[PDB]
Design a protein around this ligand. Sequence first.
Ligand SMILES: CCOc1ccccc1OCCN[C@H](C)Cc1ccc(OC)c(S(N)(=O)=O)c1
Ligand SMILES: CCOc1ccccc1OCCN[C@H](C)Cc1ccc(OC)c(S(N)(=O)=O)c1
Ligand SMILES: *[C@@H]1O[C@H](CO)[C@@H](O)[C@H](O)[C@H]1NC(C)=O
Ligand SMILES: *[C@@H]1O[C@H](CO)[C@@H](O)[C@H](O)[C@H]1NC(C)=O
Ligand SMILES: *[C@@H]1O[C@H](CO)[C@@H](O)[C@H](O)[C@H]1NC(C)=O
Ligand SMILES: *[C@@H]1O[C@H](CO)[C@@H](O)[C@H](O)[C@H]1NC(C)=O
Ligand SMILES: *[C@@H]1O[C@H](CO)[C@@H](O)[C@H](O)[C@H]1NC(C)=O
Ligand SMILES: *[C@@H]1O[C@H](CO)[C@@H](O)[C@H](O)[C@H]1NC(C)=O
Ligand SMILES: *[C@@H]1O[C@H](CO)[C@@H](O)[C@H](O)[C@H]1NC(C)=O
Ligand SMILES: *[C@@H]1O[C@H](CO)[C@@H](O)[C@H](O)[C@H]1NC(C)=O
Ligand SMILES: CCCCCCCCCCCCCC
Ligand SMILES: CCCCCCCCCCCCCC
Ligand SMILES: CCCCCCCCCCCCCC
Ligand SMILES: CCCCCCCCCCCCCC
Ligand SMILES: CCCCCCCCCCCCCC
Ligand SMILES: CCCCCCCCCCCCCC
Ligand SMILES: CCCCCCCCCCCCCC
Ligand SMILES: CCCCCCCCCCCCCC
Ligand SMILES: CCCCCCCCCCCCCC
Ligand SMILES: CCCCCCCCCCCCCC
Ligand SMILES: CCCCCCCCCCCCCC
Ligand SMILES: CCCCCCCCCCCCCC
Ligand SMILES: CCCCCCCCCCCCCC
Ligand SMILES: CCCCCCCCCCCCCC
Ligand SMILES: CCCCCCCCCCCCCC
Ligand SMILES: CCCCCCCCCCCCCC
Ligand SMILES: CCCCCCCCCCCCCC
Ligand SMILES: CCCCCCCCCCCCCC
Ligand SMILES: CCCCCCCCCCCCCC
Ligand SMILES: CCCCCCCCCCCCCC
Ligand SMILES: CCCCCCCCCCCCCC
Ligand SMILES: CCCCCCCCCCCCCC
Ligand SMILES: CCCCCCCCCCCCCC
Ligand SMILES: CCCCCCCCCCCCCC
Ligand SMILES: CCCCCCCCCCCCCC
Ligand SMILES: CCCCCCCCCCCCCC
Ligand SMILES: [Ca+2]
Ligand SMILES: [Ca+2]
Lengths: 757, 757
Amino acid sequence: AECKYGLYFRDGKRKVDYILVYHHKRDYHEDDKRFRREEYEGNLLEAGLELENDEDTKIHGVGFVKIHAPWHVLCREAEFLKLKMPTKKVYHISLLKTINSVLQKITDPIQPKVAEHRPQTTKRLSYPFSREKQHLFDLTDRDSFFDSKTRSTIVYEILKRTTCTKAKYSMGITSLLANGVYSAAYPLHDGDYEGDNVEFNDRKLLYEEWASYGVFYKYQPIDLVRKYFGEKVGLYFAWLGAYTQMLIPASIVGVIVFLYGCATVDENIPSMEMCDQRYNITMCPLCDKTCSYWKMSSACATARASHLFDNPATVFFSVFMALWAATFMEHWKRKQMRLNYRWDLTAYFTNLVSIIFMIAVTFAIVLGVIIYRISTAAALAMNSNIRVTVTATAVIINLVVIILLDEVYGCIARWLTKIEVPKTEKSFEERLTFKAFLLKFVNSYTPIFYVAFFKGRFVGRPGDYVYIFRSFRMEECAPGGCLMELCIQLSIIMLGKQLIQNNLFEIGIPKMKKFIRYLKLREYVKRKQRYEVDFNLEPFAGLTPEYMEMIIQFGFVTLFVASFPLAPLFALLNNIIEIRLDAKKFVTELRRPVAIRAKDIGIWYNILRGVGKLAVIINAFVISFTSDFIPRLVYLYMYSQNGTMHGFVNHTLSSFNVSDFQNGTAPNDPLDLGYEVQICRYKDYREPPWSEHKYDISKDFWAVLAARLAFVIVFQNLVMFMSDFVDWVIPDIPKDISQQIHKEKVLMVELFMREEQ
Amino acid sequence: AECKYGLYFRDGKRKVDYILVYHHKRDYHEDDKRFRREEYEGNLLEAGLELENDEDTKIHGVGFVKIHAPWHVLCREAEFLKLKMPTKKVYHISLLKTINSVLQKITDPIQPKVAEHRPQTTKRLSYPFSREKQHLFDLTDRDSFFDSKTRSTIVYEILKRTTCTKAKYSMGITSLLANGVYSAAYPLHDGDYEGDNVEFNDRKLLYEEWASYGVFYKYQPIDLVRKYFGEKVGLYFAWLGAYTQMLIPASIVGVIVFLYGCATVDENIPSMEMCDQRYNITMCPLCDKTCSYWKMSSACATARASHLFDNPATVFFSVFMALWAATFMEHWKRKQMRLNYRWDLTAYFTNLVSIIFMIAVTFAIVLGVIIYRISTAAALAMNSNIRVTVTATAVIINLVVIILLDEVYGCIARWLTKIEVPKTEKSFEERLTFKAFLLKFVNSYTPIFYVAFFKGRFVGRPGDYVYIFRSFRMEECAPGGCLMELCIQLSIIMLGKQLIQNNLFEIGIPKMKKFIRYLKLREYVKRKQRYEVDFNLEPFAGLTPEYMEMIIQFGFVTLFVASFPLAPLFALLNNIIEIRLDAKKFVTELRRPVAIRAKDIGIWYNILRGVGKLAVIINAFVISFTSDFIPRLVYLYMYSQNGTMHGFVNHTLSSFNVSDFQNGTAPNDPLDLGYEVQICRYKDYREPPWSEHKYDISKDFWAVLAARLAFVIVFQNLVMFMSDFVDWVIPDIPKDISQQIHKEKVLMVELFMREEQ
Ligand SMILES: CCOc1ccccc1OCCN[C@H](C)Cc1ccc(OC)c(S(N)(=O)=O)c1
Ligand SMILES: CCOc1ccccc1OCCN[C@H](C)Cc1ccc(OC)c(S(N)(=O)=O)c1
Ligand SMILES: *[C@@H]1O[C@H](CO)[C@@H](O)[C@H](O)[C@H]1NC(C)=O
Ligand SMILES: *[C@@H]1O[C@H](CO)[C@@H](O)[C@H](O)[C@H]1NC(C)=O
Ligand SMILES: *[C@@H]1O[C@H](CO)[C@@H](O)[C@H](O)[C@H]1NC(C)=O
Ligand SMILES: *[C@@H]1O[C@H](CO)[C@@H](O)[C@H](O)[C@H]1NC(C)=O
Ligand SMILES: *[C@@H]1O[C@H](CO)[C@@H](O)[C@H](O)[C@H]1NC(C)=O
Ligand SMILES: *[C@@H]1O[C@H](CO)[C@@H](O)[C@H](O)[C@H]1NC(C)=O
Ligand SMILES: *[C@@H]1O[C@H](CO)[C@@H](O)[C@H](O)[C@H]1NC(C)=O
Ligand SMILES: *[C@@H]1O[C@H](CO)[C@@H](O)[C@H](O)[C@H]1NC(C)=O
Ligand SMILES: CCCCCCCCCCCCCC
Ligand SMILES: CCCCCCCCCCCCCC
Ligand SMILES: CCCCCCCCCCCCCC
Ligand SMILES: CCCCCCCCCCCCCC
Ligand SMILES: CCCCCCCCCCCCCC
Ligand SMILES: CCCCCCCCCCCCCC
Ligand SMILES: CCCCCCCCCCCCCC
Ligand SMILES: CCCCCCCCCCCCCC
Ligand SMILES: CCCCCCCCCCCCCC
Ligand SMILES: CCCCCCCCCCCCCC
Ligand SMILES: CCCCCCCCCCCCCC
Ligand SMILES: CCCCCCCCCCCCCC
Ligand SMILES: CCCCCCCCCCCCCC
Ligand SMILES: CCCCCCCCCCCCCC
Ligand SMILES: CCCCCCCCCCCCCC
Ligand SMILES: CCCCCCCCCCCCCC
Ligand SMILES: CCCCCCCCCCCCCC
Ligand SMILES: CCCCCCCCCCCCCC
Ligand SMILES: CCCCCCCCCCCCCC
Ligand SMILES: CCCCCCCCCCCCCC
Ligand SMILES: CCCCCCCCCCCCCC
Ligand SMILES: CCCCCCCCCCCCCC
Ligand SMILES: CCCCCCCCCCCCCC
Ligand SMILES: CCCCCCCCCCCCCC
Ligand SMILES: CCCCCCCCCCCCCC
Ligand SMILES: CCCCCCCCCCCCCC
Ligand SMILES: [Ca+2]
Ligand SMILES: [Ca+2]
C-alpha cells in the first residue's frame, strides 16, 4: 500500500539495494549458523548499513533481509574507486558528408524511438568524482545522481569486503553461500513489464522497443541496454549485431555463384558422356559375394548434381571468403574503440591433469569413427531411392548420439578443472573455457574429416583386396562419388540441428521447470511483495554457452566453404531470430544480474584468429584431392588432340579380366544383366591386361600427383601474403576518435586550472 | 691559467654549457645576418641565459659564443619535464642460488674495475622533481646535483624553444644552421684522455677500461657509458654484446658437424665409384665447336670435396638453426625490460614517388645479372687449376662493382626522400631507413640467388639445344656440379669483404681528412683553449650505418646455412674486433653528441622478424632442389636389389648417339682421347637410343619430382609450428622484475603520505 509493495522500507524513504534470504526452519549446527549470521549482521552494521528482517510470509521456513546504504557511504565508496561523472562543461563537436546525410535520410524509418537516438551536437565533460572537489559536479539532486545499478554495485563491493571474526580466512558472501548458511542474494527489478495501469520504467520500454518479434528489422538501443544491465552484457549484443551485419554482402555472391552453375549444366561434356546410352560400359561389383555387375548410365542424376558444386566459380568464391574474414576482424577491432571511448572506459597436479586431458582428447577422437561406422551399419541393416534414404537415416542416427555425448564431455571438463586447485577466479574461467572448447571441437568436427579425406582411398585393386582382421573388407565410396554425401551431411546438420531442435529446446526447457514447481508447490488475491515475486524467477547462469554456440557456428562457414556455396545464407536466417530470442530471456525470465566492468570480449579473439588461420590449409587440400579439377586440367593440356574435353571418361577407366578373381570373391550370379560378361571396368591408373606388366602403376599416376602437390604450395603462400597485406594497410584506430581526445585534453588543462578555481 | 683553459668564464665561477660559432669575416646580406643573430641573442637574453663573445683567435674569421644557465632556470626546466631523481628513502632488496654464487666466484677476473660493479643490496627511491615539494630531495650541493649531460640537454631544449621575431615561422637553431647564419654548435668534453699530469675524469677511465685492444675478454661498464654519452648510444652496445654472446654455443655444433664429415669421407660409395679408373665413361662436350669429350675420373677431387657439405648432419643443423633465432628474439625481449627498469624509463607526390621507387627497385634487380655475366665473361677471356682461378677472379671482379654501386644507390635514396615533403622529423628517418635497406638488400643478395636456383637448368638436350637471339647458347654448370661455386662465393665474401677491407677503410678514412686539413692549413707552444681544441674534431653522423652493417651481416648466417656449416664461426671473429673498434671512435675521434631518451631500438625489430620468417622457405628449397639427398633416398627404397648404395652413378646417366649431332655442333677433333667415340653419356632422365621413343622423358622423371615437392610441404609446416611453440611457452616479462615494482608501489603509498608530511 504505502510501501509501494516492498520497494521502500516501512517508513517509505529508504530504498532496498540488496536482499539476502536464509532458511530459518521453524540442532547444534543450526545454532552455529545462526551465531555466524548474527556476527555477519553485526559486522555489516559496523560497516554502516541499515538492517531489517521479515518473517511473516506464505512460503514456509524463509526469511528475508533488507540492505540500505546512506549518502556518505556512497560518496566515500565512489571516491575510493575511479568513477567518472558528467560535468557542467559543454563543448561543440569538432562530398563525403552529403552521402552520410542521404543515408541518414533514407535510414530514418528503421531507427528505434528512444531519447538517446536524437542527434546531439554538444557533449559534456567527465572527471573523476572525489570529496575534495565537489564544486565541479552539480549536487542538486541526491536521488537522480546515482543509478540503481551503480547503487547496487557499491553494496556488493561492501559485502565482498566484509569478513567474519570466527572464520578469519573466510571473506565475503561467496564463502557463506558456498557453506550453506545462506540461500541466495539478488538485487530487485524496477517493476512490471505488462499491464494497462503500469507506470513508465526502463523494463517496459525495453520490452516494447527491443525484445519483440515484430520489430526484427530495426536497430538496437545499445545505450539503454548498457544503462539497465551493464557493460558485459552490451558487448555480447554489439558483437552479435556486428557479426550479423557482415553476412548480407556475402549471402548474395554465393547465390549468384550457385545460380551460375544451373544455367550451364546442359552443355557439360563430362556429364553428357556418362548419361549417354549408346555405349555399353559394364563395371565391376562393389562388394563381396552379394553385389553384382552394374552399368554407368545408372548414375546420371548424381553426375548432373555434382556439377553444381565444383567449377571455377567455386574457386573464386574460396579466394573471396579468404579475405572476407580478414576484413571482418579489422572492422570489429576498429568498432570496439568507439564503444570504449563513449562509455568512459579509456605443480605435479598440474602436469598430471594435463596428461590426463591429452589422454581423454585422444580417446574422444578415437570413439567418433566407431560411432559413425556403427550408425552406418545399423542404417544399412534396418532397410534390408535406397542410397539417399540410407545416408539420411545414418546421419539422423549419429546426430542423437553426438547430442548425448556433449553433456558427458562438459561434465568431465568441469570435474577435471575442479580437481586442480585454481589460483584465482579469472584463471578458473579461462581454463574451463579452453577445456570445454577443445572437447566440443573434437566432438563436432570428427565425422566430417573422415568422409572428406579417408573414406574409400586405401582399398586395393580387383584381385588383390585389403582385409582387416583377415575377415572384414574395407568399404568403398558411393557409385557416383564421395562428394555427394558431404553435401547431404552439411545441409542436414546446418538446417536441422542448429535451427530447429536447438531453438525449440531453448524455448521449452523453462516450461518443464515451471510445471514441476507448480506440481510440487500444491488462489492469490492479495498483491505479493517484490521479493516474493522475484523469488520465483530463474537465476542467471553466465555468458559462456552463448559465445560457444556462435563460435562453433563460425567454423562451418569458413572451413568447409570450398564445396558448399550456400553456407553463409543458412546462418543469416538463424542470426535474425537469435537476437530477439535471446532478448526476451533477460527481460522476462531470468533474475537481474549485477554489473561488471569490461573493456574487451576476452579470450574468444584468439580462438577466432586461430580458426581463421587454420581454414586455409583445409581449403587448399579440399580443392586439390577431393574434386576433379586437377585431372581435367592435366587432360586438357597434355593428352587431347582437339584441345577440347572429348574422351575424358574414356581416359579415367581401367580394365580387368573377370577370370582372375580370387577364390570366394566372384559374384553368385553373373547373368542378371542378361548377357555374358568377360571384361569389367574400374576407376584407377594401372596397366592393361594385354601387357607385359599387368595391373601395375603407370606413368600417368605420377604426372597427376605432382600437379596436385604444386597447387597447395602456390595457393597457401599466395593466400597468406594477401591476408597479411590487408592487415598491414588498414590502420587500427579511427582518425576522428583520436583527434577528439587532444582537444578535450587541451580544455582539460583549463579544467585542472578550474580545480583550484 | 686561472680559467682552466676555457672551461669556466673569466670570473671563474660560470661553467660553459654550449658553444655557438659564427663566420665573422673581417655586404647587405652580411648585415642582415648580423641583425638576425643580434635579435636571436636578444631573445636568448630575454630567456635568461648569460652571453659572452671572443674574437681574438689564431684562426681567421671565426667568433665563439658562450652560453651559461642559472639555478632557477634549471629548476624550472627540470620541473617542466618528467625528470626522476634519487631520494633518501632506502629499502633492502627483496640450490639455484648456489649455482649463481659459484659462477660469480668463477667470473671474478673478467669483470671490469669500476665502482658501480660492486654489489649493492640496497637501492634508493626515485620521485619526480618539482618546486612544490623540495623537502623529499636533498639539495645539499648544487654543483653535484646535475650532471653535465642533463645540464646541456636543458640548454638545448631552451635553444629549440627560441623563435625569431623577423622570421615568425622559423623556430629553433636548426633553421638558423640550415640557412647559413651559423656554422656549428656542440657541447664540450670533460678533458684529456692521455697524459701523465692529467687529473681523473670519465674520459680517461673509459679509455683505459673500455676502449682498448688489450681488454677484449672483459665485460662492458654499460652504466658509465650511459652516464657519459646517453641512453641511445648504450642500447646499441648492449644489443651488440647480447648478439655476440649467443654465437659461442652455435659456433661449436657447426665445428662438430664439419668434423663429422671428414672422418667418413673414405667410406663413401658414390664418391668411390666416380674415382675408380676401371671403367671407361666418356662424357659429351660442354660447349659448341671448341670443347671436346672428357672423362669422369677428372672430377674426383670435386666429388670428394662435395661430400663435406651435404649429409644428414647438415639437415639436423638446419633444424637447429631454425630454433636458435627464435630463442635469441625472446632473450633480447626479456633483456630489454631490465634495462628499462634500471634506467628509470618505466598525396599525388607520395604515389608518384612510390611508383618511381618500384621502378628503380626493378631496374636494380635487373642490372645485377648483367654485371655478373659480364664479369664471368671477362674473367674467362683474361686467362685465355684453371676453373678455381677463373671463379675466384670473377668473384673478385664483381665485388668491386658492387662496392661502387652501393654509394650511388644510397644517394638516389636520399634524393628520393628529399623530393617528397616530410611531415615531421621521425617519419623522415623512418622512411629513409626503409628506402636504403631495400636497395642494399637487393644489391647484396642478387648474385647468390642466381647461381643457386637458375644457372644450368633450362639448357635443352644433346641434339636440341636452346639459343637466345638465335646466336648465343646458354651456359652450363661446372663439371662436378654447381654446389662448389656457392661455397667459394660465400667464403670469399665473408672472409674478405666484411672483415679486411671494411675495417681497413674504417680505420684509414679519417687519416686522409687529417692530412688534407694539415696541407690546407699551412709551431704551437701556448696552450690552446677548449673550444679551439674541440673545433678540430670530426662531427657525429648517426647510428644508421652501424645498425645497417650488422643487420646485413645477420642475413648471411640464417638464409644460407643449409650448405655452409662454418658461417657462425666467421661472424664471431669479426664481432670480437668490432666492439673495441667502435669504442675508440667515440672517445678519441668524434665530437660529443647530445643526449636523447629512448626506450627501444626501434624499427629494426620488424626487419629482424621478417628475415627470420623468410629464411625457412629458402632453406627448404635449397635442401630440396640443390642437393642429391632426395634422389639417393628414392634410389635406395625403390630401385636397389641389395638394399645398399651400389649402382647409383649407373642409374643417373643417359646415352646419346654421336651421329645425330646438329650441323655446326660437333667437336672439331674427336681423336684427342686416343680412341674412336661412338656413344657419349650425359646426366638426365630420358629414353635410350635403342627404343621406340628416343630421348623422351621417362617414368622416373615424374617419380622424383613428387618426392621433391612433398618435402617442402612437410618441412615448412613442421618448422613453423615448432617456431610458434617456443614463443608460446616462454613468458615475456621476468618474474622478479615485476615482483619488485609492487613492493616499491606499496612503499610509495607511504611516500605519497610523506609528500604532505
Ligand atoms: C584420389 C586420390 O588418389 C590417390 C592418392 C593417394 C593414394 C591413392 C589414391 O587413389 C585412390 C585409390 N582409389 C581407387 C583409384 C578407386 C577405385 C574405384 C573403383 C574400384 O573398383 C571397385 C576400385 S578397386 N578397389 O577395385 O581398386 C578402386
Ligand atoms: C635438377 C632439377 O631438375 C629439374 C627440375 C625442373 C626442370 C628441369 C630439371 O632438370 C634440370 C636439367 N638439367 C639437366 C638434367 C642436366 C644436364 C647435364 C649435362 C648435359 O650435357 C652437357 C645436359 S644437356 N644440355 O646436354 O641436356 C644436361
Ligand atoms: C548393350 O546393352 C543393351 C541394354 O539393354 C542390351 O540390350 C544390348 O544387348 C547390349 N549389347 C551388347 C553388344 O552388349
Ligand atoms: C573433336 O574430335 C572429334 C573426333 O576426333 C571430331 O569429330 C571433332 O570435330 C573434334 N572437334 C573439334 C572442335 O576439333
Ligand atoms: C576407351 O579408350 C580405349 C583406349 O584407346 C578405346 O579403344 C575405346 O574405344 C574407348 N571407348 C570409347 C567408348 O570410345
Ligand atoms: C583373360 O581374358 C582373355 C580374353 O580377353 C582370355 O583369353 C584369357 O584366358 C584370360 N586370362 C586367363 C588367365 O584366363
Ligand atoms: C680405356 O681407357 C684407357 C685410358 O687410357 C685406355 O688406355 C684404354 O684403351 C680404354 N679402353 C677402351 C676399351 O676404351
Ligand atoms: C651388392 O650387390 C653385389 C652385386 O649384385 C654383390 O656382389 C654384393 O654382395 C651385394 N652386397 C650385399 C651387402 O648384399
Ligand atoms: C650402367 O647401366 C646399364 C644399364 O643396365 C648397364 O648395362 C651397365 O653395365 C652399367 N654400367 C656399369 C659400369 O655397371
Ligand atoms: C646410332 O648408333 C648405332 C650404333 O650404336 C648406329 O648403328 C646407328 O646408325 C646410329 N644412328 C644413326 C641414325 O646413324
Ligand atoms: C505483428 C507481427 C507481424 C510479423 C510477424 C513476424 C514473425 C517472425 C517472422 C520472422 C521472419 C524472418 C525471416 C526468416
Ligand atoms: C543490426 C540488426 C540487423 C538485423 C537484420 C535485419 C534484417 C536483414 C535482412 C536482409 C535480407 C537480405 C537477403 C539476401
Ligand atoms: C535426370 C536428371 C535429374 C537432374 C536433377 C537436378 C536437381 C536440381 C535441383 C535444384 C533444387 C534447387 C532448390 C533451391
Ligand atoms: C577477390 C579476389 C578474387 C580472385 C579470384 C582468383 C581465382 C581465379 C580462378 C580462375 C580459374 C580458371 C580455371 C580455368
Ligand atoms: C560499414 C562498413 C564496414 C566495413 C565494410 C568492409 C567491406 C564489406 C564488403 C566485403 C568485402 C570483401 C572483399 C573480399
Ligand atoms: C574496416 C573498414 C573496411 C573498409 C573497406 C576495406 C576493403 C578492403 C581493402 C583492402 C583490399 C586488399 C586487396 C588485396
Ligand atoms: C585410416 C583409418 C584411421 C583414420 C583416422 C582419422 C579419422 C579422422 C580424424 C579427424 C581428426 C580431426 C578431428 C577434429
Ligand atoms: C592414416 C594413414 C593410414 C595408412 C594405411 C596404409 C594402408 C596400405 C594399404 C593400401 C595401399 C594401396 C591403396 C590403394
Ligand atoms: C525421392 C527422393 C527424395 C530425396 C530426399 C533427400 C532429402 C535431403 C534433405 C536435405 C535437407 C534437410 C533439411 C531438414
Ligand atoms: C505475434 C507473432 C508471434 C511469432 C512467434 C514466433 C515463434 C518462433 C519460435 C522459434 C522457432 C524455431 C524453429 C523455427
Ligand atoms: C587440433 C586443433 C584444435 C583447434 C585449433 C585452432 C584453435 C586455436 C585456439 C587458440 C587458443 C588460445 C588460448 C589462449
Ligand atoms: C593463437 C592464434 C594462432 C593459432 C594458430 C594455430 C594453427 C595451427 C595449425 C597447425 C598446422 C601445422 C601442423 C603440423
Ligand atoms: C592463388 C589461387 C589461384 C591460382 C590458380 C592457378 C591455376 C590457374 C589455371 C591454370 C593455368 C592456366 C594457364 C592458361
Ligand atoms: C698488450 C696487448 C696484448 C694482446 C694484444 C691483442 C691484440 C688483438 C688480438 C685479438 C685477437 C682476437 C681473436 C681473433
Ligand atoms: C660481452 C663481451 C664478450 C666479448 C667476447 C669474449 C671472447 C669470447 C671468446 C670465445 C671463444 C670460443 C671459441 C669457439
Ligand atoms: C685427390 C683427393 C683430394 C681431396 C681433397 C680434400 C680437401 C680437404 C681440405 C680440408 C681443409 C680444412 C681446413 C680447415
Ligand atoms: C634441435 C632439433 C633437431 C631435430 C633434428 C631432426 C632432423 C633429423 C634428420 C634425419 C635424417 C635421416 C636421413 C636418413
Ligand atoms: C644467459 C642465457 C640466455 C638464454 C639461453 C638460451 C639457450 C642457449 C642455447 C641455444 C639453444 C638452441 C636450441 C635449438
Ligand atoms: C630467454 C631464456 C631462454 C631459456 C632457455 C630456453 C630454451 C628453449 C626452450 C623451448 C624448447 C622448445 C622445443 C620444441
Ligand atoms: C632465367 C633468367 C632470368 C633470371 C631472373 C632471376 C635472377 C635472380 C633473381 C633474384 C631475386 C632476389 C634478389 C634479391
Ligand atoms: C624464370 C622462368 C623462366 C622459364 C624459361 C622457360 C624456358 C623453356 C626452355 C627450356 C625447357 C627445357 C629445359 C631442359
Ligand atoms: C692449387 C689450388 C689453389 C686453390 C685456391 C683456392 C682459393 C680459395 C680461397 C677461399 C678463401 C679466401 C679468403 C680470402
Ligand atoms: C698493442 C696491440 C695493438 C694491436 C693493433 C691491432 C690493429 C687491428 C686493426 C684492424 C685490422 C682489420 C683487418 C684484420
Ligand atoms: C623482396 C624481399 C625484401 C625483404 C623482405 C624481408 C624484410 C622485411 C622488412 C619489414 C619492414 C617493416 C617496416 C615497418
Ligand atoms: C613485418 C614482419 C613480417 C614480414 C614477413 C615478410 C615475409 C614475406 C614472404 C613472402 C612469401 C610469399 C611470396 C608470394
Ligand atoms: C621436419 C624436417 C625433417 C623431416 C625428415 C623427413 C625424411 C626422413 C627420412 C625419410 C623416411 C625414412 C623412414 C625410415
Ligand atoms: Ca540457439
Ligand atoms: Ca666494419
